[PDB]
Design a protein around this ligand. Structure first.
Ligand SMILES: CCCOc1ccc(S(=O)(=O)N2CCN(C)CC2)cc1-c1nc(CC)c(F)c(=O)[nH]1
Ligand SMILES: [Mg+2]
Ligand SMILES: [Mg+2]
Ligand SMILES: [Mg+2]
Ligand SMILES: [Zn+2]
Length: 298
């Protein structure tokens, strides 16, 4: 055991309300690593994951310290805090967004772990990992990393599932993590949008289900764009540091481009599926106003 394991194991886990992890506008800047650890335990607990799958407290905690340990602090945006936020947004979309009741326990378990794991050991967008010839290279690696951790002694938070469940869960986790390739998202979103405009959308279909989960993954991953302006500004600043340092005049422009190309349609779609995820669409719109205005002062 580490000092850090003992502390987190021995801690008390505040309520979801106390931790604020149910608000789409949640933010982590004032939180310590430990407090994120607790927030994470709180997420598994309130989603019924510890209950329904008999996770030993020490195992869960060890699993989380592991996940956290395998993000790089030296990377400005793509690090534990981003993974932590992705999962918190997943949580909020499940509870506040009233999406929990459209999905199976196993899907949820999988989405949460996927959310936490989907960028494991990421080195910043400007860094290269070589192998043979290239195919979501990165996301395949994040998944490997994820599985390694899941399979480590002391960290096996899935021990409590039958093989059948276990296999199912892994498949979902893997697909979730791979959905975080923006390339995959652009290939697949057309179909998602068609279904919506043609009133055809139906979650009871295996194929559409898997697609929604992919969409849901991307929505949480990009959710920083939906945050209150003072927070969105600060994240944009982290993203900028990773993009360029590892003028700032071109940035509000890129942000508007990013929102137009990628984010608005998605959060519109997600809002059709669930009217209670509107707060994300709303946030994203406000931020577009903010960035556009700036790009015009340029
Ligand atoms: C403000 C710094 C620049 O911000 C961006 C600039 C360009 C584009 S992009 O969509 O045109 N395209 C995406 C694929 N690669 C990255 C090539 C560029 C995205 C962002 C952007 N991305 C994310 C997701 C990581 C954010 F969370 C965020 O705030 N900003
Ligand atoms: Mg700290
Ligand atoms: Mg990514
Ligand atoms: Mg063991
Ligand atoms: Zn990500």
């Amino acid at each position: 055991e580490t000092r850090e394991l003992q502390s987190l194991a021995a801690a008390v886990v505040p309520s979801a309300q106390t931790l604020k992890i149910t608000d789409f506008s949640f933010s982590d800047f004032e939180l310590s690593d430990l407090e994120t650890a607790l927030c994470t335990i709180r997420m598994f607990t309130d989603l019924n994951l510890v209950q329904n799958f008999q996770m030993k407290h020490e195992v869960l905690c060890r699993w989380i310290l592991s996940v956290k340990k395998n993000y790089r602090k030296n990377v400005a945006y793509h690090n534990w805090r981003h993974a932590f936020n992705t999962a918190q947004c997943m949580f909020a979309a499940l509870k506040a967004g009233k999406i929990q009741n459209k999905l199976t326990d196993l899907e949820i378990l999988a989405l949460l772990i996927a959310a936490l794991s989907h960028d494991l050991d990421h080195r910043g967008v400007n860094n290269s990992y070589i192998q043979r010839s290239e195919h979501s290279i990165m996301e395949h690696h994040h998944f490997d990393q994820c599985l390694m951790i899941l399979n480590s002694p002391g960290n096996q938070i899935l021990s409590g599932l039958s093989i059948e469940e276990y296999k199912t869960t892994l498949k979902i986790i893997k697909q979730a993590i791979l959905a975080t390739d923006l390339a995959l998202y652009i290939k697949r979103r057309g179909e998602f949008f068609e279904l919506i405009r043609k009133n055809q959308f139906n979650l009871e279909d295996p194929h559409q289900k898997e697609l929604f989960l992919a969409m849901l993954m991307t929505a949480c991953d990009l959710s920083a764009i939906t945050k209150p302006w003072p927070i969105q500004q600060r994240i944009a600043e982290l993203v900028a540091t990773e993009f360029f340092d590892q003028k700032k005049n071109k940035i509000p422009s890129m942000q508007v481009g990013f929102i137009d190309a990628i984010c608005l349609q998605l959060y519109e779609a997600l809002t059709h599926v669930s009217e209670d995820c509107f707060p994300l669409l709303d946030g994203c719109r406000k931020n577009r106003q903010k960035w556009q205005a700036l790009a015009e002062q340029q």
